[PDB]
């Protein structure tokens, strides 16, 4: 990935590492709470400006910021309709069992592909560099997964065709 | 039909809270002194100005100046700068980075890599926590 | 139970008391909190049962207090605590409405839920905006409310009784003395 | 199921339940049920009148008019004997069982009635094959578009027979999947010896269909199967007819099966992803 | 000198006069006290009547009183009566939350950096047997995260999250007397804004004062360090680097400076005399850490079931002590005051504690 | 009513 | 629970906690003779076929403790009698089981010891000892007359099937 | 000549099947599903991943029992389902082989237990709209279908919407009242004990009280319950001593046939003739958590709803469901409810004196056919109603809003 994806991964990793810093802030607007600030979007005091790391029109990522949480949204490089369908289904099956992850959301941001979430409650009970490493690894392995799914469906079609044609 | 309406019309302050030129940059470009072109591009930032015109002008000029560079003197260009200059640079690259199309990716990525090699994560922190619309 | 746990009505009724005390909380805006719950799973939390069993509760811990403002959830034709308060204040005279609104107390241990004052004040402001000013927000700015929430909201009646007995003990003409009981045509001694 | 069956098991089951208690006296067991099967055709079983001693079965064929115009006198005596009567429901072939007369056979009759749709469908293809076999002047080509908006065309000339398929996909999701499915249909031949040639065409309709008002458009593919006597004789005729008739539902079912297969694969990969993630939690 | 007191994080820490007792918040609705035993630590007491989360503790060198300032909009002043601890209810008139607290050198008043856009100051009263509370709300526009006090106890700096780090002037005539002349200003009455930050430089997470009371320094989320030198004409010095944001402030002497945060290890700074510029000092704590592991035949198969078998606990942060020391919460001092500080301690969000030295390095 | 009493 | 005890008049005496309800027996003990065939053991045997199924028992009256103890001992009696061969052998086994030393209430080795009381004085100790011995002997004599049948001279499967259905999930052992 | 829709009543037990506008569910098959799984050990990172076409190499239905080389694995467990891939495989197999219905040109109605979580319904609806591309879908509780089917008992023309239904199930039996078409949301309780654990208890007792059966053919032996072999009992101990006294005429015998060696084996019938069915009113035998009867639960749920609806509800209790086929069930329930309600009325009258005498509350239990299946006819009438074609969720609704359209529940609202 030295000449194709390495710089993009390095830049996004540095951005995440800088924006992975978090702290606990007692609720300032609603009685007594410590709920995530990014989702609520109550006070502009805590929010930080969004950032994007991208190299092509159809692929993108977004990096948010706040005291309580940092939100990241990705957009995959999908070209053909089969790629879009497979990505949507795979992400949906990932959603259906997102409880064990403790990091992932429950529905992607509108107009974008899957997005993750971090919080001060997920930074001490879990390691720090491991989470960013996993996000990176997912970003790389998505293309492998989609290509493998494509070849699998092609093989299935071939085998069914061969099985039917033999009778003739 | 009650809570439907917002009640968020408060009073507590929800944190209620010099552009660049073109002729000099063009002269530097045609003369070939790319370092002078970049220096002029970074000069006179729109730190205090509320108008999309100057913002887009600065973004376009910095993008055009950066694109023309080659991947041999980028280190020299970055080195001949001050730390505040490096931060302002990185801010400009991030600003123009959203600009898609016209293959404005690779050069920006190399610039970001060099800035990290020199500016460090502190530049990322500063750009992320700067309510200042730059 | 829906979540899939079977519970009795003998002792587990007391078991859920601690879980409600720790995890259960009330919201500020129902829509935003519901969207957060259905879009995220950070609000999930548990508690260690006496037998060591572990249970997950992330969404049920939020809608239970909502019955206070929406008695419809539990088969009651209620109107809501905030709406009831607004109606009661309005039905009174005029000179007393402002004084009642200025001074208000949140008494009782069941009101110790975190976030109830915010929900109540927001609801009252919404009622004032919609049923009086018809959405005129400009005139709504000066309206003021200060909920009285003493730190000792777990026990305040005992304080009142103690202070009353402090000064109402020397004089014997306050109580239903034992002597009056032996007579007929009695009771309703004072009111 | 891999090869979609042709015997509707609903009629088999209901007739088995009826006949297993047939020899139990005056047992009418009034029945009135409506069914549906592939090709968008509706079945109907109902007694003709208050007399429950007779059970009737009917069809609602979409292209029935073509069958009536062609004439199926062969089908009126070969497979179905005297237990066929004029149409009642919608001018479509309807049969009935005479319970008063002793039914000798039990499985053969049920099996014969099970393939009603294909039994009536064959009246045209088998007759065209007979035309080309008998040496009679090549009967005029015909087009048979069934309930689906797509169309079917057949040409029966000397020394060989031809058949072409038109394909239409409704939902945008399955269009590309079906295109991929049929792309490899025209090439898979390394496991078949005595099999016909297969080809796929979508942009350029075959020159045969230019004059015929068959399925013509943009998002419509074409499939043609070349026919030869080595696989269209009196022995290998029923198998070929069953395969071609069950072609559409076969494609559909295997598309859904592939969808389930990919669902299972992604579900399996989620476990690996979770295992990779678990490296972040402490010991 | 690393040590561990609990796996889960710890909110705040407080120490006694002799450095023999410790206060550790277990990140739960209570607070614990740890005491020395030879060269070992062991629990002694267990104080709990607060139904919320504790987020601020402090200790009185002489009064031996402890204050729990946290959630529930309340605050209890603990006092020792024989061999047991008892509470003391206080009233603060808060509606959102309270995070940080701090007593005074003379032990006459304490302040709370409440999250309700207000700063509260309280003093002892024997009349009603209560703790009366005043409020400062004029310039404040957001939450306050750090509070520090001045020897005379009349000047207070309350860092906030609105780009400002401002000194105040609180003087309760009931329990306060006129302070001596100060270079800053006139020691004006309670509830007023003395001066504000020169410009916008990130948020504020800490503040530090000086014995001479002529220099103030604070840190920010923008990887910046400031030093408000009031001896000159309000000379302001600034410095920056590539380090991650700092979350603490303290100095040794009139020129030195110490800080720590998400960098996972201490960072040292210094201030010039007349140049009006700071400098940098790298890893004054120690050169670097080390890493080790083991076979663990059981683990080799246990990890493969959930994680990858070849995986392990090794990390890039092991070499530079950046593996387990997850972030730094705040800082404290050991000996004397902010003059020599022969030793300095720091808190960690990892749930542990550690000590350091300033002379054992011996340059 | 609008002012005074409900109706 | 639902099928709790019965036949307990207030005049009945007690020994610390238990109810010294008379039992009719030809043996000797600190109990009187009741002419009616009805007694504690008869009701216990009558209701044992169902008490085991239930998983709770509220002690409405003091006789509930007697019912619990008698059923608990009957469980062990059935367990030990399943391997019987002759009526004489079964009677011998039941007799040698009655004259034993089982955990007395108020001492270790006794289930649900919390519910029962702890005797303090000396005399009540042997009073309870004799009462429990008499109850055990009467239970043994009562089981042997119905557990066996005139034919096959073996324990009926119907009466030993409940061997594994230990009351309250545990037995004396 | 509009095509009829499709009616399906999925569940833990025998899954009903057939088409709308018909008077008999044509196909009634178990939920048993085959699979070509075997003994791999890596079963938690590749559950199956069957190579090639072996994935579909599995049978279904009654034919799936007699395949002794695969695994019979029931996907459902009292409503909740762990893995739904088997459910999708079963659904495709049924729709294609048995129903032979094209999803793209048909409407499907599905039934789920009231306790089914929103997530399962949302995801099954998503699966349907994605794979089957069904134009319309609709899911509703089975109580109303039973109420509609109950009209056939007598006087169909006489409209009677009020009542209450206590339906059975392989793993769940629920209580749901109806008040003139509108049900009460909060007055619903879920009973975990059902017609399966009863058989578990039967076989557990039998494995010790008798011998002469093989381990494999146990459930076929345990299915004496489905035969005439279980009567309910007003009293428990009375019949216990009746059996322990005579034990000659009341005992029955079994003459089952082995399915392997074709060797006859017989065993007697004992106390289980009544204990099983009696467990319904004494659930404490099986489930220790739920020590609560049924009749008192019925009265409690009927006493937690408005006054004006309490009276007609007691008059209409429907006997629908397989587990309710036990004889004399209605008599016991009616007698118990009458006793408790009369006692409550007498207590209420005692506190306030008066020479009056309120008209006694009438409680009646109705016995009729359709008890085995009361959901299929309801679904048929559901499909036959034109308004169904309008209320059914459409494709475009699922296209961008998502599968949340099917999340509507009768016990939720904000
Ligand atoms: N005649 C019967 N006698 C006893 N039990 C029966 C009888 N018919 C059905 N059952 C029982 O009722 C259960 C089926 O009830 P049913 O509700 O149709 O299953 P489901 O919940 O999947 O719809 C079966 O497990 C069966 O044991
Ligand atoms: Mg059911």
From Swiss-Prot, chain A:
The keyword Cytoplasm applies. GO terms for biological process: actin filament polymerization; Arp2/3 complex-mediated actin nucleation. It is found in: Cytoplasm, Cytoskeleton; Cell projection; Nucleus. Its main location: cytoplasm. Keywords: Acetylation, Actin-binding, Cell projection, Cytoplasm, Cytoskeleton, Nucleus. InterPro entries: ARPC2/4 (IPR034666), ARPC4 (IPR008384). One of its GO terms (cellular component) is cell projection. Disulfide bonds: none annotated. SUPFAM superfamilies: Arp2/3 complex subunits (SSF69645). It holds the Pfam family ARPC4. The modification N-acetylthreonine is found at residue 2. One of its GO terms (molecular function) is actin filament binding. Component of the Arp2/3 complex composed of ACTR2/ARP2, ACTR3/ARP3, ARPC1B/p41-ARC, ARPC2/p34-ARC, ARPC3/p21-ARC, ARPC4/p20-ARC and ARPC5/p16-ARC. Belongs to the ARPC4 family. Actin-binding component of the Arp2/3 complex, a multiprotein complex that mediates actin polymerization upon stimulation by nucleation-promoting factor (NPF). The Arp2/3 complex mediates the formation of branched actin networks in the cytoplasm, providing the force for cell motility. In addition to its role in the cytoplasmic cytoskeleton, the Arp2/3 complex also promotes actin polymerization in the nucleus, thereby regulating gene transcription and repair of damaged DNA. This is Actin-related protein 2/3 complex subunit 4.
Curated annotation (Swiss-Prot), chain B:
It is found in: Cytoplasm, Cytoskeleton; Cell projection; Nucleus. InterPro entries: ARPC5, ARPC5_sf. It holds the Pfam family P16-Arc. Coiled coil: none annotated. GO terms for cellular component: Arp2/3 protein complex; cell projection; cytoplasm; cytosol; nucleus; site of double-strand break. Polyubiquitinated by RNF128 with 'Lys-63'-linked chains, leading to proteasomal degradation. GO terms for molecular function: actin filament binding. One of its GO terms (biological process) is regulation of actin filament polymerization. Component of the Arp2/3 complex, a multiprotein complex that mediates actin polymerization upon stimulation by nucleation-promoting factor (NPF). The Arp2/3 complex mediates the formation of branched actin networks in the cytoplasm, providing the force for cell motility. In addition to its role in the cytoplasmic cytoskeleton, the Arp2/3 complex also promotes actin polymerization in the nucleus, thereby regulating gene transcription and repair of damaged DNA. Component of the Arp2/3 complex composed of ACTR2/ARP2, ACTR3/ARP3, ARPC1B/p41-ARC, ARPC2/p34-ARC, ARPC3/p21-ARC, ARPC4/p20-ARC and ARPC5/p16-ARC. This is Actin-related protein 2/3 complex subunit 5.
Swiss-Prot record, chain G:
There is a cross-link at residue 13 (Glycyl lysine isopeptide (Lys-Gly) (interchain with G-Cter in SUMO2)). It comes from the Eukaryota. SUPFAM superfamilies: Arp2/3 complex 21 kDa subunit ARPC3. InterPro entries: ARPC3, ARPC3_sf. Keywords: Acetylation, Actin-binding, Cell projection, Cytoplasm, Cytoskeleton, Isopeptide bond, Nucleus, Phosphoprotein, Ubl conjugation. The keyword GTP-binding does not apply. Coiled coil: none annotated. Component of the Arp2/3 complex, a multiprotein complex that mediates actin polymerization upon stimulation by nucleation-promoting factor (NPF). The Arp2/3 complex mediates the formation of branched actin networks in the cytoplasm, providing the force for cell motility. In addition to its role in the cytoplasmic cytoskeleton, the Arp2/3 complex also promotes actin polymerization in the nucleus, thereby regulating gene transcription and repair of damaged DNA. Belongs to the ARPC3 family. Component of the Arp2/3 complex composed of ACTR2/ARP2, ACTR3/ARP3, ARPC1B/p41-ARC, ARPC2/p34-ARC, ARPC3/p21-ARC, ARPC4/p20-ARC and ARPC5/p16-ARC. This is Actin-related protein 2/3 complex subunit 3. It comes from Bos taurus (Bovine). The gene is ARPC3.
From Swiss-Prot, chain H:
SUPFAM superfamilies: Actin-like ATPase domain. Pfam families: Actin (PF00022). GO terms for molecular function: actin binding; ATP binding. Its main location: cytoplasm. Gene3D superfamilies: 3.30.420.40, Actin, Chain A, domain 2 (2.30.36.70), Actin, Chain A, domain 4 (3.90.640.10). Keywords: Acetylation, Actin-binding, ATP-binding, Cell projection, Cilium biogenesis/degradation, Cytoplasm, Cytoskeleton, Nucleotide-binding, Nucleus. It is found in: Cytoplasm, Cytoskeleton; Cell projection; Nucleus. One of its GO terms (biological process) is cilium assembly. Belongs to the actin family. ARP3 subfamily. ATP-binding component of the Arp2/3 complex, a multiprotein complex that mediates actin polymerization upon stimulation by nucleation-promoting factor (NPF). The Arp2/3 complex mediates the formation of branched actin networks in the cytoplasm, providing the force for cell motility. Seems to contact the pointed end of the daughter actin filament. In podocytes, required for the formation of lamellipodia downstream of AVIL and PLCE1 regulation. This is Actin-related protein 3. The gene is ACTR3.
């Amino acid at each position: 990935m030295t000449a194709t994806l390495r710089p993009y991964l390095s830049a996004v990793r540095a951005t995440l590492q800088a924006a992975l810093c978090l702290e606990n802030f007692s609720s300032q607007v609603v009685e007594r709470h410590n709920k995530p600030e990014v989702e609520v979007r109550s006070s502009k005091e805590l929010l930080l400006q969004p950032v994007t790391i991208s190299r092509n029109e159809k692929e993108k990522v977004l990096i948010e910021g706040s005291i309580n949480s940092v939100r990241v949204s990705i957009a995959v490089k999908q070209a053909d309709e089969i790629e879009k369908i497979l990505c949507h289904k795979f992400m949906r099956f990932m959603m259906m069992r997102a409880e064990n992850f403790f990091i992932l959301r429950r529905k992607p941001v509108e107009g974008y592909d899957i997005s993750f979430l971090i919080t001060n409650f997920h930074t001490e009970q879990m390691y720090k560099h491991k989470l960013v490493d996993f996000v990176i690894h997912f970003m790389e392995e998505i293309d492998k997964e989609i290509s493998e799914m494509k070849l699998s469906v092609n093989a299935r079609a071939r085998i069914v065709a061969e099985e039917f044609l033999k009778n003739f | 039909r009650f809570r439907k309406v917002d009640v968020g019309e408060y009073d507590e302050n929800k944190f209620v809270d010099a552009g660049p030129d073109e002729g000099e940059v063009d002269s530097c470009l045609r003369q070939g002194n790319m370092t002078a072109a970049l220096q002029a591009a970074l000069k006179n930032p729109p730190i205090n100005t509320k108008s999309q015109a100057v913002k887009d002008r600065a973004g376009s000029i910095v993008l055009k100046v950066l694109i023309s560079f080659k991947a041999n003197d980028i280190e020299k260009a970055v080195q001949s700068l001050d730390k505040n200059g490096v931060d302002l640079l990185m801010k400009y690259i991030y600003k123009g980075f959203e600009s898609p199309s016209d293959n404005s990716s690779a050069v920006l990525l190399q610039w970001h890599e060099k800035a990290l090699a020199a500016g460090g994560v502190g530049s990322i922190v500063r750009v992320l926590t700067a309510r200042k619309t730059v | 139970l829906l979540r899939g746990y079977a519970f009795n009505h003998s002792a587990d009724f007391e078991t859920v008391r601690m879980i409600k005390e720790k995890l259960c909380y009330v919201g500020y805006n129902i829509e935003q909190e519901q969207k957060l719950a259905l879009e995220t799973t950070v609000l999930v939390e548990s508690y260690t049962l006496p037998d060591g069993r572990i249970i997950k509760v992330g969404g049920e811990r939020f809608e239970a207090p909502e019955a206070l403002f929406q008695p419809h959830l539990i088969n009651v034709e209620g109107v809501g605590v905030a709406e009831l308060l607004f109606n009661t204040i309005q039905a009174a005279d005029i000179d007393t409405r402002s004084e009642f609104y200025k001074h208000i107390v949140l008494s009782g241990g069941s009101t110790m839920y975190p976030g109830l004052p915010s929900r109540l004040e927001r609801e009252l402001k919404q009622l004032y905006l919609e049923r009086v000013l018809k959405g005129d927000v400009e005139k709504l700015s000066k309206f003021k409310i200060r909920i009285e929430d003493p730190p000792r909201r777990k026990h305040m009646v005992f304080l009142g009784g103690a202070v009353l007995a402090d000064i109402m003990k020397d004089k014997d003409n306050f109580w239903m003395t034992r002597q009056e009981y032996q007579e007929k045509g009695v009771r309703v001694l004072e009111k | 199921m891999i090869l979609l069956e042709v015997n509707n098991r609903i009629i088999e089951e209901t007739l088995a339940l009826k006949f297993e208690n047939a020899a139990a006296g005056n047992k009418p067991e009034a029945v009135e049920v409506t069914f549906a099967d592939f090709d968008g055709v509706l079945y109907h079983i109902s007694n003709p009148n208050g007399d429950k001693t007779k059970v009737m079965v009917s069809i609602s064929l979409k292209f029935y008019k073509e069958l009536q115009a062609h004439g199926a006198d062969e089908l009126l005596k070969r497979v179905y004997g005297s237990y066929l009567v004029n149409p009642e429901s919608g001018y479509n072939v309807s049969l009935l069982y005479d319970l008063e007369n002793l039914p000798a056979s039990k499985d053969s009759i049920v099996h014969q009635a099970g393939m009603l749709k294909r039994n009536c469908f064959a009246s045209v293809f088998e007759k065209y094959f007979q035309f080309q076999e008998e040496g009679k002047e090549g009967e005029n080509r015909a087009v048979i578009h069934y309930r689906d908006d797509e169309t079917m065309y057949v040409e029966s000339k000397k020394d060989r027979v031809t058949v072409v398929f038109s394909t239409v996909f409704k939902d945008d999701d399955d269009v590309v999947i079906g295109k991929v499915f049929m792309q490899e249909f025209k090439e898979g031949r390394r496991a078949s010896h005595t099999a016909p040639q297969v080809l796929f065409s979508h942009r350029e309709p075959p020159l045969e269909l230019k004059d015929t008002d068959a399925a013509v458009g943009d998002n419509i593919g074409y499939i043609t199967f070349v026919l030869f006597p080595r696989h269209t004789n009196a022995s290998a005729r029923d198998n070929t007819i069953n395969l071609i008739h069950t072609f559409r539902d076969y494609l559909h079912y295997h598309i859904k099966c592939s969808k389930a297969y990919i669902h299972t694969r992604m579900r399996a990969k989620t476990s690996d992803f979770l295992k990779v993630l678990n490296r972040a939690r402490p010991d | 000198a690393y040590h561990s007191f609990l796996v889960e994080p710890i909110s705040c820490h407080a120490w006694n006069k002799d450095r023999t007792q410790i206060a550790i918040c277990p990140n739960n609705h209570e607070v614990h006290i740890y005491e020395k035993s030879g060269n070992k630590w062991v629990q002694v007491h267990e104080l709990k009547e607060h139904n919320g989360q504790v987020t601020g503790i402090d200790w009185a060198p002489d009064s031996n009183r402890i204050v729990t300032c946290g959630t529930d909009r309340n605050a209890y002043v603990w006092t020792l009566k024989g061999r047991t601890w008892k509470p003391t209810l206080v009233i603060l008139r808060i509606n959102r939350a309270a995070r940080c607290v701090r007593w005074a050198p003379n032990e006459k008043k304490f302040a709370v950096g409440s999250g309700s856009r207000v700063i509260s100051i309280c003093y002892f009263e024997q009349e009603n047997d209560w703790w009366v509370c005043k409020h400062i709300k004029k310039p404040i526009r957001s939450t306050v995260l750090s509070l520090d006090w001045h020897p005379n106890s009349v000047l207070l700096a309350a860092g906030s999250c609105d780009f400002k780090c401002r000194i105040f002037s609180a003087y309760i005539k009931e329990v306060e007397e006129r302070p001596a002349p100060t270079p800053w200003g006139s020691k004006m009455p309670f509830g007023e804004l003395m001066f504000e930050s020169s410009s916008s430089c990130g948020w504020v997470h800490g503040v530090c004062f000086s014995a001479n009371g002529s220099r103030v320094a604070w840190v920010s989320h923008d990887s910046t360090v400031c030093l408000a030198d009031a001896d000159k004409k309000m000379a302001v010095a600034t410095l920056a680097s590539e380090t991650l944001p700092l979350l603490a402030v303290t100095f040794i002497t009139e020129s030195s400076l110490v800080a720590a945060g998400h960098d996972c290890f201490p960072v040292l700074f210094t201030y010039d005399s007349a140049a009006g510029k700071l400098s940098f000092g790298g890893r004054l704590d120690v050169p670097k850490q080390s890493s080790q592991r083991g076979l663990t035949a059981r683990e080799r198969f246990q990890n493969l079931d959930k994680k990858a078998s070849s995986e392990g606990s090794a990390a890039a942060g092991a070499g530079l002590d950046s593996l387990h020391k997850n972030s730094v919460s705040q800082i404290s001092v050991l000996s004397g005051g902010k003059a020599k500080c022969s030793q300095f301690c720091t808190t960690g969000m990892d749930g542990g504690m550690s000590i350091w030295d300033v002379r054992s390095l011996e340059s | 009513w609008x002012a005074x009493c409900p109706a | 629970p639902a099928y709790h005890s019965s036949l307990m008049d207030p005049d009945t005496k007690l020994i610390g906690n238990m109810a010294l309800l008379p039992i009719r027996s030809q043996f000797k003990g600190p109990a009187p003779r009741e002419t009616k065939d009805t007694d504690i053991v008869d009701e216990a045997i009558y209701y044992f076929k169902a008490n085991v199924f239930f998983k709770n028992y509220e002690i409405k009256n003091e006789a509930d403790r007697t019912l619990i103890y008698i059923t608990l001992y009957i469980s062990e009696c059935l367990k030990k009698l399943q391997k019987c061969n002759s009526k004489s052998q079964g009677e011998k086994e039941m007799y040698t089981l009655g004259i034993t030393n089982f955990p007395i209430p108020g001492e270790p080795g006794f289930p649900l010891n919390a519910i029962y009381a702890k005797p303090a004085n000396k005399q009540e100790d042997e009073v309870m000892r004799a009462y429990l011995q008499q109850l055990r002997q009467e239970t043994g004599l009562r089981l042997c007359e119905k557990v066996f049948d005139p034919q096959n001279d073996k324990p009926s499967k119907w009466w030993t099937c409940f061997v594994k259905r230990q009351f309250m999930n545990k037995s004396l052992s | 000549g509009r095509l009829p829709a499709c009616v399906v009543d999925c569940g833990t037990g025998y899954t009903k099947l057939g088409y709308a506008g018909n008077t008999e569910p044509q196909f009634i098959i178990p939920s048993c599903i085959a699979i070509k799984e075997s003994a791999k050990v890596g079963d938690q990172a590749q559950r199956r991943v069957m190579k090639g076409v072996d994935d579909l190499d599995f049978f279904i239905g009654d034919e799936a029992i007699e395949k002794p080389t695969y695994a019979t694995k029931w996907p459902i467990r009292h409503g909740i389902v762990e893995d739904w891939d088997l459910m999708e495989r079963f659904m495709e197999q049924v729709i294609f082989k048995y129903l032979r219905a094209e999803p793209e040109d048909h409407y499907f109605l599905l039934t789920e237990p009231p306790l089914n979580t929103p997530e399962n319904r949302e995801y099954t609806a998503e699966i349907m709209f994605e794979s089957f591309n069904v134009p319309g879908l609709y899911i509703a509780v089975q109580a109303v279908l039973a109420l509609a089917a109950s009209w056939t008992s007598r006087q169909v023309g006489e409209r009677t919407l009020t009542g209450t239904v206590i339906d059975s199930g392989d793993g769940v039996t629920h209580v749901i009242p109806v008040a003139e078409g509108y049900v009460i949301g909060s007055c619903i309780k879920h009973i975990p004990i059902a017609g399966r654990d009863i058989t578990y208890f039967i076989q557990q007792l039998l494995r010790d009280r008798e011998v002469g059966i093989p381990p494999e053919q146990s459930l076929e032996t345990a299915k004496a319950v489905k035969e005439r072999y279980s009567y309910v009992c007003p009293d428990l101990v009375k019949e216990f001593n009746k059996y322990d006294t005579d034990g000659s005429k009341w005992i029955k015998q079994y003459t089952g046939i082995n399915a392997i060696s074709k060797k006859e084996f017989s065993i007697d019938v004992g106390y289980e003739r009544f204990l099983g069915p009696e467990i319904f009113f004494h659930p404490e035998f099986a489930n220790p958590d739920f020590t609560q009867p049924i009749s008192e639960v019925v009265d409690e749920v009927i006493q937690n709803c408005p006054i004006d609806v309490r009276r007609p509800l007691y008059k209409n209790i429907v006997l629908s469901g397989g587990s309710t086929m036990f004889r004399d069930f209605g008599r016991r329930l009616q007698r118990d409810l009458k006793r408790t309600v009369d006692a409550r009325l007498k207590l209420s009258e005692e506190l306030s004196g008066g020479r009056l005498k309120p008209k006694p509350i009438d409680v009646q239990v109705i016995t009729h056919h359709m008890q085995r299946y009361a959901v299929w006819f309801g679904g048929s009438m559901l499909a036959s109603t034109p308004e169904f074609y309008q209320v059914c969720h459409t494709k475009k609704d699922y296209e961008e809003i998502g599968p949340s359209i099917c999340r509507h529940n009768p016990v939720f609202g904000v």
